[PDB]
Amino acid sequence: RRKGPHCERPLTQEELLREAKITEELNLRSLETYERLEADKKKQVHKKRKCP
Amino acid sequence: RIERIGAHSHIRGLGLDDALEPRQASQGMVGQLAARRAAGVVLEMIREGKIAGRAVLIAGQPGTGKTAIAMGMAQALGPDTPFTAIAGSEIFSLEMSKTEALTQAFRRSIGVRIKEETEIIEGEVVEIQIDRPSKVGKLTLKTTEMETIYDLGTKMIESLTKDKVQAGDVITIDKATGKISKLGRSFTRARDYDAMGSQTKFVQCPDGELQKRKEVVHTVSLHEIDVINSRTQGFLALFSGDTGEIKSEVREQINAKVAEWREEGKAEIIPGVLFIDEVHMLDIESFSFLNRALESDMAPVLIMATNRGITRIRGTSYQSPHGIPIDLLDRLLIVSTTPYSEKDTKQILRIRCEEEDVEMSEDAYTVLTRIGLETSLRYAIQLITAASLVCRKRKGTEVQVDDIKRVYSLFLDESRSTQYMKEYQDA
Ligand SMILES: Nc1ncnc2c1ncn2[C@@H]1O[C@H](COP(=O)(O)OP(=O)(O)O)[C@@H](O)[C@H]1O
C-alpha cells in the first residue's frame, strides 16, 4: 500500500484524425513510389565478377 | 581458272529446244539429230526422276559422237544431280570384287540432300571483352541496320578464343552448335597498323538483320553414306578406296533409313546418271549382276557407250551383239549414232577450231574436211592443233592449206602407218 499506477493522454479527435491520416496518405504514396522506382532503377537483376 | 580444253570441252550441252527438238549446230553439238533427240528424251526422264534403274545403250561407229552426246547430257544436267563417268575397265580392281565395284558405281550416283533450318547470328564483332577470375565476358555485334550486345558463356568464350576472332571481324555463329566461322575482315578490321601486320583485305559489313534464319543443305551420296557407316574409319571417301562393305544391315540399313527419311520429308531422293564408256570391257559376271542390279528401287539411270558389234563376250566364248549378252541387252533401249556427212564433219571441225581458238582459211576448211572424210574425224580434229603451231612458228595469222598439208605429211594416221609397216618391225 505505497505505490500506484497512472495514465494520461486521452485525446482522439475524429475530424482532425481523419485529416491527419489523409495527410499520412501522402507519406504512404511517397514511400511506395520511392521503393518501386529505386528498386527498378538500382536492382536491374544481375550479377557481378569474382574477387580473386 | 586453268583447266585445259579437252577433246569434249567444246560441247556445253545438247542443242535441243523446249520440245526436245535438236537444232543443227546449237550448244556445241552438230548433226546426229535422232541420237540427240533420244538423249534429250532420256535426259528429260532423268530430270523427272520417278523411275529407277533404266538403261540406255548408245551404239555406233568409232568417232561419231557417242562420248560427245554423253558429255553433252552431263553438261545439260549440270550440278545438283549426280553424273558418274566410268570406263568399263575401271571396275577390274584387286581389293574389291567386280560386283562390289558396280554397286559402288551405282550408289555413287544417288544423292541424298538433307535440308536444315539451323538459325545463326551474322554481324561484325565490335568488341570482345572477357575477364578471367571461370572467365566471363561480353560481345558487341554490329550490322549495318542495328547493334546488339551478348553475354558470352564459358564454352562460347572458349570457342571464340580458339578461333582467335577479334574486333572488326565479320563472323557467323551457329547458335545450335556454337560453330564459329569468320568470313573476312571489315573496313573497321583495320588494326591501326603500327606493328608486324601484313593483311589489309577489307570487305563490306553484313547487311540485313542481326539474328537471321537461313537454310543449309547437306548433299551426300548413298556411296559416301555406306562408306562412312562401314567402320569407325569415317574417311575412306578421301583416305583411300579400301572398301568391301558387306551387304548385311549396313547397306540395307542405309536404304531403309533413307526410305524413312523420304517418307518423313527429311531428304527424299535425287536420282543420277552413270555413263559407262566402253562397256564391252565388263565381264559376264558383271553383266549377270547388272541384270538384277538394275531392278533395285535405288538404281540410277545408266548409259553405256558401244563401238563393238557381233563379237565374243569377255570371259567366255559367246558371240553376242555389242559384246553384251542378250540377257542384259533386253533391258536396254538402243540408240544408234550415224556417221557424219561432209557438211557435218566440216561443221564439227569448224566448231572445234573455233573453240581451240585457231582461225582457218576457207580452203583450209575444205582440205581438212577432205582429210577427215578420207580418214578419221579424230585425226582431222587433231590435225588442227598441229597445223596451228607451224603457222605460229612462221608468224602467221590464220592456218592455210600448206600448213595443214605439211602437218599431214609430217604425222601419220593408222592406215598410212600400217601401209608403211612394210618391214618385219619386230612382229
Ligand atoms: N555433232 C557434233 N558436233 C560437234 N562435234 C562433234 C559432233 N560429233 C562428233 N564431234 C567431235 O568429234 C570428235 C570425236 O568424235 P566423238 O564425239 O569422240 O565420237 P566417238 O565417241 O564415236 O569417237 C569429238 O572431239 C567431238 O567434238
| Resolution of the model in angstroms | 3.2
Task: Name the residue of B279, B343, B373, B377 whose CB sits within 8 Å of the most ligand 1 atoms, as the mutation to test its pocket.
Answer: B377
Residue nearest to atom 13 of ligand 1 (CA): B378
Q: According to the entry, how was the structure determined?
A: cryo-EM
| Secondary structure element (H or E) that encloses residue B129, with its range | strand B120-131
Q: Which residues of A touch B (CB under 8 A)?
A: 49-50, 52
Q: How far apart are CA B140 and CA B160, in angstroms?
A: 13
- B185 three-state secondary structure: strand
The ligand 1 atom nearest the CA atom of B69:
17
Domain at B6-110+221-340: CATH code: 3.40.50.300
**b/e per residue B267-299 (b: at least 16 CB within 10 A):** bebbbbbbbbbbbbbbbbebbebbeebbeeebb
Name chain B contacts of A49, Cβ cutoff 8 Å: 131, 133, 136
Q: What is the pairing mode between strands B111-116 and B120-131?
A: unpaired
Could you tell me which residues are beta bridge partners of residue B120?
Answer: B174
In contact, B405 and B383? CB cutoff 8 Å: no
Interface contact B131-A52, CB threshold 8 A? no
Q: Could you tell me where the beta strands, DSSP code E, fall in B260-418?
A: 273-277, 301-306, 310-312, 319-321, 332-337
Q: Is B62 annotated as a binding residue?
A: yes
Q: How far apart are CA B113 and CA B217, in angstroms?
A: 6
Q: What is the dihedral of CA B84, B88, B94, B99, to 10 degrees?
A: 70
Nearest Cα to B340, choosing from B61, B67, B8? Answer: B61
Q: How far apart are CA B102 and CA B121, in angstroms?
A: 44
Q: How far apart are CA B227 and CA B221, in angstroms?
A: 10
Nearest Cα to B174, choosing from B231, B124, B128, B216? Answer: B216
Q: How many CB pairs below 8 A link A and B?
A: 5
**Residue B97, phi then psi, degrees to nearest 5:** -70, 165
In contact, B15 and B262? CB cutoff 8 Å: no
**Distance in Å, CA B44 to ligand 1 centroid:** 22
Q: How far apart are CA B303 and CA B333, in angstroms?
A: 9
Q: How far apart are CA B201 and CA B289, in angstroms?
A: 56
Q: Which part of chain B is CATH 1.10.8.60?
A: 341-427
List C-alpha distances in Å: A21 to A24, A26, B15, B81.
5, 9, 98, 86
Angle between helices B222-230 and B98-107 (to 10 degrees): 120
The upper half-sphere exposure of residue B27, i.e. CA atoms within 13 Å in the direction of its Cβ, equals: 17
**b/e per residue B195-234 (b: at least 16 CB within 10 A):** eeeeeeeeeebbeeebeeeeeeeeeebbbbbbbeebeeee
Residue nearest to atom 22 of ligand 1 (CA): B63
Name chain B contacts of A52, Cβ cutoff 8 Å: 133
The upper half-sphere exposure of residue B376, i.e. CA atoms within 13 Å in the direction of its Cβ, equals: 13
- Hey, CA dihedral for B55, B61, B67, B68, is it positive or negative? negative
Name chain A contacts of B133, Cβ cutoff 8 Å: 49-50, 52
In contact, B186 and B168? CB cutoff 8 Å: yes
The three cell numbers locating residue B278: 566402253
In contact, B261 and B225? CB cutoff 8 Å: no
- Burial (0-12, 13-18, 19+ Cβ within 10 Å), B9: middle
In contact, B115 and B215? CB cutoff 8 Å: yes
Q: How far apart are CA B276 and CA B305, in angstroms?
A: 6
Q: Is B233 annotated as a binding residue?
A: no
Angle, CA B115 vertex, CA B240 and CA B297 arms, to 5°: 65
Q: What is the DSSP letter of B121?
A: E
Nearest Cα to B223, choosing from B243, B194, B200? Answer: B243
Could you tell me which residues are beta bridge partners of residue B303?
Answer: B56, B275
CA B322 to chain centre: 27
| Secondary structure element (H or E) that encloses residue B347, with its range | helix B342-355
Contacts of B93 (CB under 8 A, 6+ apart): B101, B241
Q: How far apart are CA B125 and CA B167, in angstroms?
A: 5
In contact, B177 and B120? CB cutoff 8 Å: no
Contacts of B265 (CB under 8 A, 6+ apart): none
Q: How far apart are CA B207 and CA B401, in angstroms?
A: 60
Nearest Cα to B31, choosing from B341, B365, B304? Answer: B341
Q: Which part of chain B is CATH 3.40.50.300?
A: 6-110+221-340
Q: Is B104 annotated as a binding residue?
A: no
CA-based diameter of chain A, in Å? 71
| Secondary structure element (H or E) that encloses residue B112, with its range | strand B111-116
Domain at B341-427: CATH code: 1.10.8.60
- Burial (0-12, 13-18, 19+ Cβ within 10 Å), B339: middle
